Design a protein around this ligand. Structure first.
Ligand code: HEM
Length: 152
Protein backbone atom coordinates (compact mmCIF):
# COMPACT_ATOMS: atom_id res chain seq x y z
CA UNK A 1 0.00 0.00 0.00
CA UNK A 2 1.28 3.45 -0.97
CA UNK A 3 0.77 6.29 1.48
CA UNK A 4 -1.23 9.34 0.56
CA UNK A 5 2.00 11.33 0.39
CA UNK A 6 3.50 8.73 -2.02
CA UNK A 7 0.38 8.90 -4.23
CA UNK A 8 0.73 12.72 -4.25
CA UNK A 9 4.30 12.47 -5.55
CA UNK A 10 3.24 9.99 -8.24
CA UNK A 11 0.30 12.02 -9.45
CA UNK A 12 2.22 15.29 -9.23
CA UNK A 13 4.68 14.05 -11.78
CA UNK A 14 2.00 12.27 -13.83
CA UNK A 15 0.20 15.63 -14.22
CA UNK A 16 3.39 16.88 -15.87
CA UNK A 17 3.57 13.84 -18.30
CA UNK A 18 0.04 14.70 -19.25
CA UNK A 19 1.32 18.01 -20.75
CA UNK A 20 2.79 15.89 -23.55
CA UNK A 21 1.42 12.34 -23.46
CA UNK A 22 2.48 11.74 -27.09
CA UNK A 23 6.13 12.75 -26.57
CA UNK A 24 6.41 10.79 -23.39
CA UNK A 25 4.90 7.75 -25.09
CA UNK A 26 7.37 7.87 -27.96
CA UNK A 27 10.33 8.29 -25.68
CA UNK A 28 9.20 5.38 -23.41
CA UNK A 29 8.49 2.93 -26.24
CA UNK A 30 11.72 3.77 -28.00
CA UNK A 31 13.71 3.22 -24.79
CA UNK A 32 11.92 -0.08 -24.24
CA UNK A 33 12.54 -1.24 -27.83
CA UNK A 34 16.22 -0.25 -27.79
CA UNK A 35 17.03 -1.60 -24.31
CA UNK A 36 14.97 -4.72 -24.80
CA UNK A 37 14.67 -5.66 -28.51
CA UNK A 38 12.61 -8.79 -27.69
CA UNK A 39 9.78 -6.42 -26.72
CA UNK A 40 9.54 -4.96 -30.23
CA UNK A 41 8.66 -8.48 -31.57
CA UNK A 42 5.43 -8.64 -29.62
CA UNK A 43 4.10 -5.86 -31.83
CA UNK A 44 3.27 -7.00 -35.34
CA UNK A 45 2.53 -3.29 -36.11
CA UNK A 46 6.11 -2.19 -35.20
CA UNK A 47 8.50 -5.02 -35.93
CA UNK A 48 9.34 -3.36 -39.24
CA UNK A 49 11.02 -0.50 -37.33
CA UNK A 50 14.79 -1.14 -37.49
CA UNK A 51 16.29 2.17 -36.29
CA UNK A 52 15.58 4.81 -33.74
CA UNK A 53 14.92 7.43 -36.45
CA UNK A 54 12.25 5.14 -37.99
CA UNK A 55 10.68 4.64 -34.55
CA UNK A 56 10.56 8.37 -33.98
CA UNK A 57 9.04 8.90 -37.45
CA UNK A 58 6.21 6.40 -36.90
CA UNK A 59 2.88 8.05 -36.33
CA UNK A 60 1.38 4.72 -35.51
CA UNK A 61 4.01 4.09 -32.75
CA UNK A 62 3.17 7.54 -31.28
CA UNK A 63 -0.56 6.55 -31.31
CA UNK A 64 0.07 3.38 -29.37
CA UNK A 65 2.21 5.34 -26.88
CA UNK A 66 -0.69 7.70 -26.21
CA UNK A 67 -3.01 4.67 -25.81
CA UNK A 68 -0.83 2.92 -23.29
CA UNK A 69 0.09 6.03 -21.20
CA UNK A 70 -3.52 7.17 -21.12
CA UNK A 71 -4.56 3.75 -19.68
CA UNK A 72 -1.67 3.92 -17.15
CA UNK A 73 -2.77 7.43 -16.16
CA UNK A 74 -6.27 6.13 -15.42
CA UNK A 75 -4.86 3.37 -13.25
CA UNK A 76 -2.52 5.69 -11.28
CA UNK A 77 -5.36 8.13 -10.61
CA UNK A 78 -7.28 5.24 -8.95
CA UNK A 79 -4.49 5.08 -6.42
CA UNK A 80 -4.46 1.37 -5.79
CA UNK A 81 -8.27 0.81 -5.95
CA UNK A 82 -7.65 0.06 -9.66
CA UNK A 83 -9.18 -3.34 -9.97
CA UNK A 84 -11.75 -2.54 -12.70
CA UNK A 85 -9.16 -0.73 -14.81
CA UNK A 86 -6.43 -3.31 -14.33
CA UNK A 87 -8.56 -6.48 -14.89
CA UNK A 88 -9.23 -5.97 -18.66
CA UNK A 89 -5.65 -5.03 -19.33
CA UNK A 90 -4.27 -8.12 -17.50
CA UNK A 91 -6.59 -10.32 -19.52
CA UNK A 92 -5.74 -8.94 -22.89
CA UNK A 93 -2.04 -8.90 -22.14
CA UNK A 94 -1.94 -12.44 -20.82
CA UNK A 95 -4.29 -14.02 -23.37
CA UNK A 96 -4.18 -11.97 -26.52
CA UNK A 97 -0.87 -10.06 -26.67
CA UNK A 98 1.10 -12.58 -24.64
CA UNK A 99 3.33 -10.20 -22.76
CA UNK A 100 5.52 -11.67 -20.05
CA UNK A 101 5.53 -10.03 -16.63
CA UNK A 102 9.19 -9.51 -17.09
CA UNK A 103 8.36 -7.21 -20.02
CA UNK A 104 6.17 -5.15 -17.78
CA UNK A 105 9.21 -4.74 -15.56
CA UNK A 106 11.19 -3.48 -18.57
CA UNK A 107 8.31 -1.04 -19.40
CA UNK A 108 8.39 0.32 -15.83
CA UNK A 109 12.18 0.85 -16.11
CA UNK A 110 11.62 2.75 -19.34
CA UNK A 111 8.98 4.89 -17.69
CA UNK A 112 11.25 5.79 -14.84
CA UNK A 113 14.19 6.55 -17.08
CA UNK A 114 12.09 8.94 -19.21
CA UNK A 115 10.40 10.67 -16.27
CA UNK A 116 13.78 11.38 -14.91
CA UNK A 117 14.96 12.85 -18.30
CA UNK A 118 11.96 15.10 -18.78
CA UNK A 119 11.10 16.16 -15.18
CA UNK A 120 14.25 16.28 -12.98
CA UNK A 121 12.75 18.94 -10.65
CA UNK A 122 9.47 17.08 -10.03
CA UNK A 123 11.21 13.66 -10.03
CA UNK A 124 13.84 13.53 -7.34
CA UNK A 125 14.57 10.42 -5.30
CA UNK A 126 11.35 10.59 -3.16
CA UNK A 127 9.13 10.86 -6.25
CA UNK A 128 11.22 8.13 -7.99
CA UNK A 129 10.71 5.82 -4.96
CA UNK A 130 6.99 6.53 -4.98
CA UNK A 131 6.65 5.90 -8.74
CA UNK A 132 8.57 2.68 -8.40
CA UNK A 133 6.16 1.58 -5.68
CA UNK A 134 3.16 2.42 -7.83
CA UNK A 135 4.52 0.54 -10.87
CA UNK A 136 5.40 -2.45 -8.65
CA UNK A 137 1.89 -2.59 -7.27
CA UNK A 138 0.56 -2.50 -10.89
CA UNK A 139 2.85 -5.38 -11.84
CA UNK A 140 1.95 -7.35 -8.65
CA UNK A 141 -1.72 -7.07 -9.42
CA UNK A 142 -1.20 -7.95 -13.14
CA UNK A 143 0.87 -11.00 -12.06
CA UNK A 144 -1.90 -12.21 -9.78
CA UNK A 145 -4.34 -12.18 -12.67
CA UNK A 146 -1.79 -13.82 -14.95
CA UNK A 147 -1.45 -16.63 -12.34
CA UNK A 148 -5.20 -17.05 -12.25
CA UNK A 149 -5.34 -17.39 -16.13
CA UNK A 150 -2.39 -19.82 -16.16
CA UNK A 151 -0.05 -17.46 -17.99
CA UNK A 152 3.64 -17.97 -17.64
C1 HEM B 1 2.39 0.26 -18.39
C2 HEM B 1 2.21 -0.85 -19.11
C3 HEM B 1 1.19 -1.07 -20.19
C4 HEM B 1 0.02 -0.46 -20.43
C5 HEM B 1 -0.63 0.56 -19.54
C6 HEM B 1 -0.48 -0.98 -21.66
C7 HEM B 1 -1.72 -0.56 -22.20
C8 HEM B 1 -2.18 -1.06 -23.38
C9 HEM B 1 -3.45 -0.70 -23.89
C10 HEM B 1 -4.41 0.26 -23.25
C11 HEM B 1 -3.59 -1.38 -25.05
C12 HEM B 1 -4.80 -1.30 -25.91
C13 HEM B 1 -5.92 -2.16 -25.28
C14 HEM B 1 -5.57 -3.62 -25.01
O1 HEM B 1 -5.36 -4.40 -25.98
O2 HEM B 1 -5.56 -4.09 -23.84
C15 HEM B 1 -2.44 -2.16 -25.27
C16 HEM B 1 -2.22 -2.96 -26.37
C17 HEM B 1 -1.02 -3.65 -26.52
N1 HEM B 1 -0.02 -3.80 -25.61
FE1 HEM B 1 0.15 -2.93 -23.93
N2 HEM B 1 0.35 -1.90 -22.14
C18 HEM B 1 1.42 -1.99 -21.33
C19 HEM B 1 2.54 -2.84 -21.49
C20 HEM B 1 2.84 -3.58 -22.63
C21 HEM B 1 4.08 -4.13 -22.93
C22 HEM B 1 5.29 -4.08 -22.00
C23 HEM B 1 3.98 -4.72 -24.20
C24 HEM B 1 4.97 -5.44 -25.03
C25 HEM B 1 6.24 -5.62 -24.67
C26 HEM B 1 2.63 -4.53 -24.62
C27 HEM B 1 2.14 -4.92 -25.86
C28 HEM B 1 0.91 -4.49 -26.31
C29 HEM B 1 0.43 -4.93 -27.60
C30 HEM B 1 1.14 -5.84 -28.58
C31 HEM B 1 -0.78 -4.42 -27.72
C32 HEM B 1 -1.66 -4.57 -28.93
C33 HEM B 1 -1.33 -3.36 -29.80
C34 HEM B 1 -1.59 -3.67 -31.23
O3 HEM B 1 -0.84 -4.48 -31.85
O4 HEM B 1 -2.54 -3.09 -31.80
N3 HEM B 1 2.00 -3.80 -23.69
N4 HEM B 1 -1.60 -2.01 -24.18
Amino acid sequence: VLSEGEWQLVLHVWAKVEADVAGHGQDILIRLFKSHPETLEKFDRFKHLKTEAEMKASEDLKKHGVTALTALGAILKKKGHHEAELKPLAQSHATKHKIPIKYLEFYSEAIIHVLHSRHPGNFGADAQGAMNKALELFRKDIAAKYKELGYQ
